[PDB]
């Protein structure tokens, strides 16, 4: 079962927070619990609706801008790039500047949208994990 405060839908627990933190600190916060996991994750169009309720109903339905489990980047060994030959990435040369995006869930009405935002921003978030 989910701890005190954490909700559930079938086998997953959800519970957001008010303490505004950056993306890193957020992803580095949830991981530091009894059950090592990550931030919120919307895999299907069915969960995105559930995470919306336990987010507003608990946050006074106030227009939030919570973070998410997305972090795309074209740098290092964590870059969203791969080669056909299967060779790893040890050298690059892209015209575009080395970025670091950290999307979020900007809610306005009904279902919250997904928009890019500076990783160095202060907003709310939500954790998530799967029971054993």
């Amino acid at each position: 079962d989910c701890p005190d405060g954490w909700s559930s839908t079938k086998s997953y627990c959800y519970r957001p927070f008010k303490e505004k933190k950056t993306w890193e600190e957020a992803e580095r916060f949830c991981t530091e619990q009894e059950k090592e996991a990550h931030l919120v994750s919307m895999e299907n169009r069915l969960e995105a609706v559930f995470v919306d309720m336990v987010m507003e109903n608990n946050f006074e339905n106030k227009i939030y801008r919570s973070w998410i489990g997305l972090k795309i980047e074209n740098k290092g060994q964590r870059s969203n790039l791969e080669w056909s030959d299967g060779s790893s990435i040890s050298y690059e040369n892209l015209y575009e500047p080395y970025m670091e995006k950290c999307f979020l869930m900007d809610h306005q009405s009904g279902l919250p949208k997904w928009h890019t935002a500076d990783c160095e921003e202060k907003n709310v978030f939500m954790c998530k994990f799967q029971l054993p």
């Binding site: 500047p97 970025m99 670091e100 500076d118 160095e120």
Partner: protein, 124 residues
């Protein structure tokens, strides 16, 4: 922001013509205002913003940058940093800068012990 200084939304930016080392460049800004440190660029919308400031203040482009490149090593894969070495030596530890390249602005490598212009940046 004060006079001669620019403004984005929460931080102020300015350009200095007087060329100075990279060291006194960090100590200089540190004086101006509170939390005043070398100009930083952690966003495209932030880079294109400075690309216009250093274009009206000066004709060319030759100034430092708060970026700290250089070889060295924050710490070996293990824990202890790179105290003693024994490489063949072939130019590595340098400090980034910024010069025009038939477009926006790109940062290049330059001696940290050189004398070139720079910038200052402080929060509101």
């Amino acid at each position: 922001c004060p006079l001669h200084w620019s403004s984005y939304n929460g931080y102020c930016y300015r350009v200095f013509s007087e060329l100075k080392t990279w060291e006194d460049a960090e100590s200089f800004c540190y004086a101006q205002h509170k939390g005043s440190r070398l100009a930083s660029i952690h966003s495209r919308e932030e880079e294109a913003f400075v690309g216009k400031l250093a274009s009206q203040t000066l004709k060319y482009t030759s100034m430092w940058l708060g970026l700290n490149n250089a070889w060295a090593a924050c710490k070996w894969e293990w824990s202890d940093d790179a105290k003693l070495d024994y490489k063949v030596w072939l130019r590595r530890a340098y400090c980034a800068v910024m010069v025009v390249k038939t477009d926006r602005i790109f940062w290049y490598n330059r001696g940290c012990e050189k004398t070139v212009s720079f910038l200052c940046k402080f929060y509101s």
